[PDB]
């Protein structure tokens, strides 16, 4: 009975798997600047379990350990983090980018006809430029609008996504946490908004319950919106 | 000399290295399944059974694991070498001819892809295109531009409705893959690229797929992987008469853990 | 007896090799079996297959002799002395011309063989597959031709990756610029031939070939790579020769498709 059922190499391969899985499924960290690592700070976590006979076989038979449950937990944690970033938490009195008070709004418009999305983005950028924030811009869209921007038409000679990217030098991305037809344009920069991270996504041992081994993947972060006028939501 | 008596090793170290390198190089360039799946292993040739599910958890108690186990099959192909050829290679200082090993490795790779994509119902194995519990979308019409884009969009939406968010990989039959590369007037863009911004894990073609068919998979280690016990290798079977038989072989298995992460184009 | 030293010989051989490499097309789509040595003169053509009187066993494979391709050039003694005294490097243009002619001969032999000596080529093999050429002036003709060729090759169990070799006229026609098209067909064709699309000047008229690569289908048996040799002393001149010896082996004729 000890507080470390894993060796050093197994720990390294579990932690690198967690980091690698978290890296490829995060969208909110690609438009924000990280202020850390270091008002209540929320904690996001997900648990998984390991069988003791599997560890005994891995160490005795000289075979690699299976780390799929950690990958699943990390994917769920990344989904939770994106949900918190985009929509916040009403129970804790937290606001996201899509619900911040004092943000500008524009009508979504007709997107079926070619050029509608470009007109909407231009109108949002125009309203943003009126309030003193002028570039660089980043655009986040729901899967429906993102797929609709990739339609192929005749005599257009260019994909509308590149026409949009001409304006949004930071980038245009798709997010699954957005519901229905939704989009957001943000003026990037640490002076407008940022993310304060207290503890990165890491795995921790909880102690042996019965004879099996529980582990938890967890992290702690907060979103600080200093200027609410640098966000324009399509609705 | 060295052929007048029974011997355990007819080749020297350099030619064993060259043969194994040839086998590996031939194997790597003709495998499509390994470009979209994670690898669990190598586990060792002594491992013959592997779990299929994920671990969940007055008198005495009896505990029995609820996971399902399965045996790992072997894929192999044989070839033969002439003894005078080896004698001439050693005596005249000539490189040895290793084409038969390349042919055997190509056949083994084809068999591996066939097992991965369609399985084997006689032995109880399932493939990506025959799994039970997978999703399905109509194929539609791919003669006009935009049909493939619409089909992929519909498949991605149905995958998203079940909590699988990507990134996605697409595998197509040669006919659909060729149709995706056609050229039309005023369009100025190929539909393959437009599809490629929707599947960030890649779009591939496989000759194992039949007629007009395709599969979209939400990649992830927790959804599916490949359990490998032994990669392709060459072994000496022992001299029969005076010639030398060899075998190229491998052992692996496909594990489908979430069947609803697959969408086939029907 | 030889009018050159180690460094001059090395420079001559280096120039010959560099001229040879840049101009050889068939060596970019074929595997090499060798070098085997200058003493090897015969090579097998097929793959090996396994009382009161003694037994007699004979091999069932076929064998062929390896030919030699060569070209002669000259070097003058006064220029050698001037280079040695001045220390300026020698003039080696004749060797480059000889190497270019040898490369042309090798490419012609690979692509068309020699009917008199019973040597086959890719364009004249017996048992190969053929597809109609169609009309390459309008867009899509080359794409359709390559798609048909690859489909017919796939029907016989050869899955690629494929390589395409074309005559100059077809290569030029796959580079035209039409009105509101903005996409070159050569890129689309290159996206289907994973091993490459190449241009060859030995191909006659409008023609092309699609091959499925692999040592088990075809390779090149090289006994001696291109090299230079001294022929002796004649008056004051110094004759030299550039020569090589190699052969092409076709094992599966149905892995080749020609564009009729």
UniProtKB/Swiss-Prot annotation, chain C:
Claim: tRNA processing is one of the keywords in the record: no
Induction of its expression: Part of the MXAN_3553-MXAN_3554-MXAN_3555-encA operon. Expression is induced by amino acid starvation (at protein level). Not present in spores (at protein level).
Entry-linked InterPro entries: ENCAP (IPR007544), Encapsulin_nc (IPR051429)
GO CC, any one term: encapsulin nanocompartment
Compartments where found: Encapsulin nanocompartment
Keyword Transport recorded: yes
Practical and industrial applications: The encapsulin and a cargo construct (an encB-encC-encD fusion) can be overexpressed in E.coli and in human HEK293T cells. In HEK293T in the presence of 0.5 M ferrous ammonium sulfate nanocompartments can be detected and used as cell markers. Coexpression of this nanocompartment with a larger nanocompartment from Q.thermotolerans (AC A0A0F5HPP7) allows expression of different sized iron-rich particles. The encapsulin shell proteins do not seem to mix.
Disruption phenotype: Does not form fruiting bodies. Decreased survival when grown under oxidative stress (0.5 mM H2O2).
Top-level lineage group: Bacteria
Keywords recorded for this protein, A-Z: Encapsulin nanocompartment, Ion transport, Iron, Iron storage, Iron transport, Transport
GO biological process, one term: intracellular iron ion homeostasis
Note: Shows substantial structural similarity to gp5 of the HK97 viral capsid, and while the sequence homology is weak, it suggests this protein may have evolved from a viral capsid protein.
Family listed: Belongs to the encapsulin family. Family 1 subfamily.
Function as written in the Swiss-Prot or TrEMBL entry: Shell component of a type 1, iron-storage encapsulin nanocompartment. Encapsulin nanocompartments are 32 nm in diameter with an iron- and phosphorus-rich core (4Fe:1P) about 24 nm in diameter. Upon expression in E.coli most particles are 32 nm, 20% are 18 nm. The core is filled with an average of 14 dense granules, 5-6 nm in diameter that are not evenly distributed. Each nanocompartment is estimated to hold 30,000-35,000 Fe atoms. The minor proteins EncB, EncC and EncD probably lie against the interior face of the nanocompartment.
Entry domain remark: Has 3 domains; a discontinuous peripheral domain (P), an elongated loop (E) and the discontinuous axial domain (A).
NCBIfam families reported in the protein's UniProt record: encap_f1
Assembly description: The 32 nm encapsulin nanocompartment is formed by 180 subunits; monomers form pentamers which assemble to form shells. There are 36 pores where the pentamers meet as well as 3-fold axis channels and dimer channels. The N-terminus of the protein is inside the shell.
Protein name, as recorded: Type 1 encapsulin shell protein EncA
